């Protein structure tokens, strides 16, 4: 089976970025946002089915894959900046309001987009993510060991770049295997795309910048919204990895503190839900989007 049959590959020129986008379909618009250390190809098992019924837009996040900031020196990689990229992307393609489905870092861009630009986001789906403010409050010994890279990649420039850049393919391959819990989920051709991106020093730097923003400005933005009592205004679905959650850390419970309309489900797979559990993900997504069909109008 081919990868992304019938998708049209575009390069969009926005005010601050050159963005790689792939589009297919007709009907209400959906924007799908991948995570780390991946590209838009992570959606290859999901996006074709969605494009049977929806206008589907896949994008590489700024700095990841083939997307680049125009400021090659001091670009902004905050989630707020990447949220503006999404507004501009969808606007250029003809959409002022759209649903957003994110995995991992892409879900962080997505919820920030929903908070900052509620008029633009019809519905929001998070795969594996709760807001960074909640993640930081949960840090303990085991968290820091399991997610050691959240702390490494956030060290000041150019410490992590020097470390992860020594043998990029080793670090990429190690990381993908770890995130997949050793499961054979990566299409060999999608993998070559992830590898090529990670071999680019600019991509690795942009990834570090994402992690630095997570510690800093992204967390400050979440705190400001918490202080203001600002919530997501659209229906939210959260799909999470089946595992134990400590008190106060269950993803459905956390999302209900950020949004008045929340639903979700556990999926028995690795963290890499798009690639590991596409049929389960699709069943949930399709049902959610159908249930809120009027919201998508």
Active site residues: 104, 271
Question: Any idea which residue has 């507004």 for tokens?
Answer: 87
Mask for 199-218, x = binds a second copy (CB under 8 A): ----------------x---
Q: Which CB sits closer to a second copy, 218 or 263?
A: 218
- Report strand pairing: 17-24 vs 8-13: antiparallel
The tokens for 74 are 């001091």
For residues 119 and 232, give the distance between their C-alpha atoms in angstroms, rounded to a whole number: 10
Query: What distance in Å separates the CA atoms of residue 177 and residue 172, rounded to the nearest whole number?
Result: 9
Q: What's the closest the beta carbon of residue 77 comes to a second copy, in angstroms?
A: 18
Q: Is 140 in the site for a second copy (CB under 8 A)?
A: yes
The Cα–Cα gap between 230 and 233 comes to 9
Nearer CB in complex with a second copy: 166/228? 166
Beta carbon nearer to a second copy, 136 or 245: 136
Smallest distance from a second copy to CB 251, Å: 19
Q: How far is the CB of 64 from a second copy (least distance, A)?
A: 21
Please give the Cα distance from 251 to 20 (Å, whole number): 31
* 182 interacts with a second copy by CB under 8 A: no
Site for a second copy in 148-177 (CB under 8 A): 148, 150-152, 154-155, 159, 162-164, 166-167, 170-171, 174
Residue 8, SS3? Answer: strand
Close Cβ partners of 229 (under 8 Å, ≥ 6 residues apart):
none
Inter-helix orientation angle 188-198/168-179, to 10°: 130
Q: Which of residues 173 and 253 has its CB atom nearest to a second copy in the complex?
A: 173
**Residue 245 in the binding site for a second copy (CB under 8 A):** no
Question: Smallest gap, in angstroms, from Cβ of residue 108 to a second copy?
Answer: 16
Q: SS3 of 41, please?
A: helix
Q: How far is the CB of 212 from a second copy (least distance, A)?
A: 10
**Which H or E run includes 80?**
helix 79-93
Instruction: Kindly list the residues in this chain that would bind a second copy in the complex (CB under 8 A).
Output: 136, 139-141, 143-145, 148, 150-152, 154-155, 159, 162-164, 166-167, 170-171, 174, 215
């Amino acid at each position: 089976d081919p990868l992304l049959p019938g998708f049209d590959y575009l390069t969009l020129h926005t005010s601050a970025a050159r963005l790689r986008v792939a589009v297919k379909g007709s009907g209400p618009p959906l924007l799908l946002l991948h995570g780390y250390p991946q590209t838009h190809l992570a959606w290859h098992r999901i996006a074709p089915r969605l494009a049977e019924d929806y206008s589907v837009v896949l994008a590489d996040l700024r700095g990841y894959g083939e997307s680049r900031a125009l400021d090659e020196e001091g670009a902004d990689y905050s989630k707020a900046a990447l949220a503006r990229d999404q507004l501009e992307t969808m606007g250029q393609l003809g959409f002022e309001r759209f649903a957003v489905i994110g995995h991992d870092r892409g879900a962080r861009v997505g919820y920030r987009l929903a908070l900052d630009h509620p008029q633009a986001v019809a519905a929001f789906v998070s795969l594996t993510v709760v807001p960074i403010l909640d993640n930081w409050a949960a840090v303990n010994k085991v968290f820091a060991l399991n997610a050691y890279h959240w702390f490494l990649l956030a060290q000041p420039y150019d410490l992590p770049e020097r470390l992860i850049g020594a043998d990029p393919e080793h670090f990429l391959d190690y990381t993908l295997r770890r995130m997949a819990q050793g499961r054979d989920i990566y299409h060999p051709q999608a993998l070559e795309s992830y590898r090529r991106a990670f071999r680019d020093p600019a991509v690795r730097h942009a990834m570090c910048e994402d992690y630095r923003a997570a510690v800093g400005v992204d967390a400050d933005a979440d705190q400001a919204d918490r202080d203001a009592g600002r919530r997501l205004q659209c229906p939210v679905q959260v799909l999470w990895q089946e595992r134990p959650y400590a008190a106060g850390q269950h993803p459905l419970e956390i999302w209900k503190t950020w949004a008045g309309q929340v639903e979700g489900a556990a999926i028995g797979a690795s963290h890499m839900l798009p690639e590991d559990a596409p049929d389960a993900v699709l069943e949930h997504l399709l049902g959610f989007l159908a249930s809120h069909r009027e919201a998508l109008r």
